[PDB]
Design a protein around this ligand. Structure first.
Ligand SMILES: NS(=O)(=O)c1c(F)c(F)c(S(=O)(=O)CCO)c(NC2CCCCCCC2)c1F
Ligand SMILES: [Zn+2]
Length: 257
């Protein structure tokens, strides 16, 4: 139904998901000059040493790497968060051209892509329950710029030909998501939403200031994927990003400056 095309893209989503026009929708433009340094924000605690990746899946919108979230193995804590958030999956958004693709923007600048590590608050017991809560999810967002290759991304890039079309999955064990992080964990944070339907307002966003570098060849492999299923007309999976939404009555906080 929904997608990223002219006929089913972000401008249409409000008809099936009226929260699209809500008070805390994501992504947003991060105006660096209006964000508030908050000295009381804590360093982010990213504890990914025990992470158990399981599978990679083309879901028809993006691809996602999924993790075992049935124990506290890969968790996000600290920062603006109360309590412990377990990593369930990560996915990307990217463009047809290197000058677009990110969902968040920084002083209106678009990056080539954005990585989202999705976590759910363990006080709600499972991710389905967590999505129904205003503090249910925490998504760690990381910008990708085109330059030098990111060695820790290559394992992901190399399996994409085996999940070209919607509904294809592959085993994807022993992947270390620590290899996708930049040097610094300085971040902005604000309360928002899922950026795909159902657009639920259940997300604390934590967006890292420091992008990672990926090579032009790595991002060209993302653009080889297909939105369509096997045996259907080929539609390249590109421009799977929602544009910035109105900030409304929100303040973006910075952990730095
Ligand atoms: N940008 S985002 O982090 O809000 C987002 C997506 F863009 C997204 F595409 C997905 S997806 O890969 O699973 C595809 C469409 O759902 C999730 N995943 C979460 C949201 C969906 C419901 C379950 C809560 C945890 C997964 C998702 F959280
Ligand atoms: Zn996302």
């Amino acid at each position: 139904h929904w997608g990223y095309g002219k006929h089913n893209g972000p401008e249409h989503w409000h008809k099936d998901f009226p929260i699209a026009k809500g008070e805390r929708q994501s992504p947003v433009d991060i105006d660096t000059h209006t964000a508030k340094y908050d000295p009381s924000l804590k360093p982010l605690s990213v504890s990914y040493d025990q992470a158990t990746s399981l599978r990679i899946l083309n879901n028809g919108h993006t691809f996602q790497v999924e993790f075992d979230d049935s124990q506290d193995k890969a968790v996000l804590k600290g920062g603006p968060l109360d309590g412990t958030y377990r990593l369930i999956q990560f996915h990307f958004h990217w463009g047809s051209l290197d000058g677009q693709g990110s969902e968040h923007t920084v002083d209106k600048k678009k990056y080539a892509a954005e990585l989202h590590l999705v976590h759910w608050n363990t006080k709600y017991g499972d991710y389905g329950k967590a999505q129904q809560q205003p503090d249910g999810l925490a998504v760690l967002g990381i910008f990708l710029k085109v330059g030098s290759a990111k060695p820790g991304l290559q394992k992901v890039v190399d399996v994409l030909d085996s999940i070209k079309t919607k509904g294809k999955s592959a085993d994807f064990t022993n992947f270390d998501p620590r290899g996708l992080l930049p040097e610094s964990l300085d971040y902005w944070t604000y309360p928002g939403s899922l950026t795909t339907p159902p657009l639920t307002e259940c997300v604390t966003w934590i967006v890292l200031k420091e992008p990672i570098s990926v090579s032009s060849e790595q991002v060209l492999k993302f653009r080889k994927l297909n939105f369509n299923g096997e045996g259907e007309p080929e539609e390249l999976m590109v421009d799977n990003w929602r544009p910035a939404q109105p900030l409304k009555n929100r303040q973006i906080k910075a952990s730095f400056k």
